[PDB]
Design a protein around this nucleic acid. Structure first.
Length: 234
DNA sequence: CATCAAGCCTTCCTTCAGGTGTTGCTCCAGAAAGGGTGT
């Protein structure tokens, strides 16, 4: 269907996971249903859901951005945007002279069509490592290429099934090249880290017409980009 | 190459002419007596 993208301009850049932790710390004392909505927690406990999370943080040059997938995620972002903006306004009016928080909002539709020619898509800061078995797959390129193939195809199928639209099942993807390999730490000052890929390029015969999220740690702000900017790039 | 804009208000009829003159029926609905004249 359609997804929603809300940008919060603050005047200074804060990272997606840091903004996630900041709105977790700030709105915690009051309104527990709303933070249970935005961090996609279980209705009874603090543990997040194992399914596809509808609302995820993203990257903004002057602040942070929020993505609500589908009608439910769009409604959650719609009921949560003024409370988040008021919390940011009070937090940054408590200290200093005080800044003005600007907003932006977009409703990007989702579409996909199969074409008989390959198409190029570059994904920045995608997490692909979670276990030791994937590390054993990563050492050899032949058994790692098929792993990236299946990961990209399953991420596309999971997002298409989560948003509620049908995807053709004859898609042939291919993975060409990589630029860098780095690490991602969920919590600062922790020994544990997950391997991640920087500037991967992929080739799929079909075309995409919106924000598409691939890989792991999608909620934290990893492995997503707009295909609308990348088709006809400029 | 994708959205975001994807109007808003208020006007939203007014007076007046809004008939005049005529026409506004006519006629006949019988049969015999007493003359001709034409066959």
């Amino acid at each position: 269907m359609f997804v929603k993208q809300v940008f919060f301009d603050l005047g200074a850049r804060i990272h997606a996971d840091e903004a996630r932790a900041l709105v977790a710390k700030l709105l915690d004392d009051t309104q527990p249903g709303l933070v249970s909505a935005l961090m996609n927690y279980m209705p009874a406990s603090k543990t997040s859901k194992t399914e596809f999370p509808l609302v995820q943080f993203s990257n903004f040059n002057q602040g942070f951005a929020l993505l609500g997938f589908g009608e439910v995620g769009a409604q959650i972002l719609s009921d949560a945007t003024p409370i988040i903006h008021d919390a940011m306004a009070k937090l940054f009016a408590s200290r200093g002279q005080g800044v003005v928080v600007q907003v932006s909002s977009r409703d990007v539709p989702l579409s996909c069509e199969k074409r008989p020619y390959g198409l190029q898509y570059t994904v920045a800061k995608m997490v692909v490592q979670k276990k030791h078995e994937h590390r054993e797959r990563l050492a050899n390129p032949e058994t790692g290429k098929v792993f990236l193939e299946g990961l990209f195809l399953r991420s596309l199928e999971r997002q298409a099934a989560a948003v509620g639209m049908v995807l053709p099942r004859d898609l042939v993807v291919s993975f060409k090249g990589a630029e860098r390999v780095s690490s991602v730490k969920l919590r600062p000052d922790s020994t544990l880290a997950h391997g991640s890929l920087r500037h991967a390029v992929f080739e799929v015969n079909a075309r995409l017409g919106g924000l598409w999220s691939v890989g792991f740690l999608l909620s934290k702000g990893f492995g997503h980009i707009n295909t609308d900017l990348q088709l006809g790039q400029g």
